[PDB]
Design a protein around this ligand. Structure first.
Ligand SMILES: Nc1ncnc2c1ncn2[C@@H]1O[C@H](COP(=O)(O)OP(=O)(O)O)[C@@H](O)[C@H]1O
Ligand SMILES: N[C@H](C(=O)N1CC(c2cc(F)ccc2F)=C[C@H]1c1ccccc1)C1CC1
Ligand SMILES: [Mg+2]
Length: 330
């Protein structure tokens, strides 16, 4: 049930001038990724995995959005909850897939930058889709980050990153939590998206100087809630509420990361049908527990490197992502 896709990033400039041989080969039509495990392009041993979708190095942001994100966004707009995880070693493209970057020299506007990732495109498409049709709606976003089992709000513009948030169980709905003081920024229109994202980037920079390896060791959860009151061309009123969580996981390479540690164990118990799932043993898994064997539709995008140097880690990732496929929810 949980759909997992693989995305291989392309060799960087440093690897180009050093003329690197890729140990990774993708086959989109056959949903397969093959990895050279022994060495030699003339003769070798290989490991092969089949996932729900595979994207090779030539894949652009647009392909990933039209393929994986558009159908999920549609489900969200119907009143469902969806989650998308980016999993993989640091430097493989987890942030590039989820957030994206800017094209050099101000060549484009944030709405047309071909380097934009899932988060900017989605906020732009929500307004694009709901504004056209006759629908009343409000968009709220939120950016929760976890570092060393502490919670931080990266969008509140009246608090510094030295102020952690408190987490309690929600006495109302089970297996849910309440984050005291978490801010929800209302995005009144498409032309209000970029700055909210800019604010989070700046505050995140203060976070990095205050915590070691912050961007490598932290988990970020960018949430977008959509309150909708649709009115068909007839006069029917549809009040749907959708929530989409975009999670940029800590680097999977191996102090301790309890949330990452617990995520691997939660997945294990779910796939092996173990009665006890260790959701509560980490902030990340308590927060997103409905996205792991719950009533949420979730997708995992595993990012890998094609360089032979990252062999051990590329396999860990694939192998980790291949087991997640057996997780069933709803
Ligand atoms: N699919 C891709 N296309 C072009 N460049 C990419 C791609 N994936 C990663 N990169 C580049 O690789 C480097 C690793 O980036 P990053 O996304 O921040 O890694 P991570 O978040 O997994 O630690 C960046 O300089 C980025 O521009
Ligand atoms: N460096 C910046 C940047 O590229 N980004 C900031 C960003 C981002 C930052 C967050 F906190 C939370 C979610 C996000 F998605 C992603 C990108 C982006 C945004 C729009 C188009 C292309 C790429 C910009 C804002 C200054
Ligand atoms: Mg990163």
């Amino acid at each position: 049930n949980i759909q997992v896709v693989v995305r291989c990033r392309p060799f960087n400039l440093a690897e180009r001038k050093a003329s690197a041989h890729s140990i990774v080969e993708c086959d989109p039509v056959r949903k397969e990724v093959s990895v050279r495990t022994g060495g030699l392009a003339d003769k070798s041993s290989r490991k092969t995995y089949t996932f729900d979708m595979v994207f090779g190095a030539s894949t652009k942001q647009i392909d990933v959005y039209r393929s994986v994100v558009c159908p999920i966004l549609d489900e969200v707009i119907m009143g469902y909850n969806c989650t998308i995880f980016a999993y993989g070693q640091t430097g493989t493209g987890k942030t590039f897939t989820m957030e994206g970057e800017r094209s050099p020299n101000e060549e484009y506007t944030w709405e047309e930058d071909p380097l934009a990732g899932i988060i900017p495109r989605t906020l732009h498409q929500i307004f694009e889709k709901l504004t056209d049709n006759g629908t009343e709606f409000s968009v709220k976003v939120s950016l929760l980050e976890i570092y060393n089992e502490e919670l931080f709000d990266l969008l509140n513009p009246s608090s510094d990153v030295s102020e952690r948030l408190q987490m309690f169980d929600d006495p109302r709905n089970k297996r849910g939590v309440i984050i005291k003081g978490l801010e929800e920024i209302t995005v009144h229109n498409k032309d209000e998206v970029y700055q909210i994202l800019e604010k989070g980037a700046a505050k995140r920079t203060t976070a990095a100087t205050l915590m070691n390896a912050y961007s490598s060791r932290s988990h970020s959860v960018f949430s977008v809630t959509i309150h909708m009151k649709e009115t068909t061309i007839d006069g029917e009123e549809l009040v749907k509420i959708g929530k989409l969580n975009l999670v940029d996981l800590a680097g999977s390479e191996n102090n301790i990361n309890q949330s990452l540690l617990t995520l691997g164990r939660v997945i294990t118990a779910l796939v092996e049908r173990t009665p006890h799932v260790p959701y509560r043993e980490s902030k990340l898994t308590r927060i997103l527990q409905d996205s792991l064997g719950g009533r949420t539709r979730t997708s995992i995008i595993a990012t890998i490197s094609p360089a032979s140097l990252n062999l051990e880690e590329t396999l860990s990732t694939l192998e980790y992502a291949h087991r997640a496929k057996n997780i069933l929810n709803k």
